[PDB]
Symmetry: C4
Subunit: 24 residues, 4 copies
């Protein structure tokens, strides 16, 4: 319910996805 925590959550998922794609 903290918009900062929910947003950082979504963004942290986004970040790891981008890292894996660049690693593959």
């Amino acid at each position: 319910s903290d918009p900062l925590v929910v947003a950082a959550s979504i963004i942290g998922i986004l970040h790891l996805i981008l890292w894996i794609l660049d690693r593959l």
Copy 2:
């Protein structure tokens, strides 16, 4: 209200900004 969780949220957003700027 947990400063640890709030700070890591802020930091995780900054980290993705830095990652994308290195990518761009």
Copy 3:
């Protein structure tokens, strides 16, 4: 909240992968 919990697990995985990537 399962999104926060999911991001938590994912962030832990990310640092492990990044560390191994530089190891």
Copy 4:
């Protein structure tokens, strides 16, 4: 939530390491 707290600690470490790796 100890999981979210653990992942908060790790996320802060992660960026510390990432910046030092670039310096």
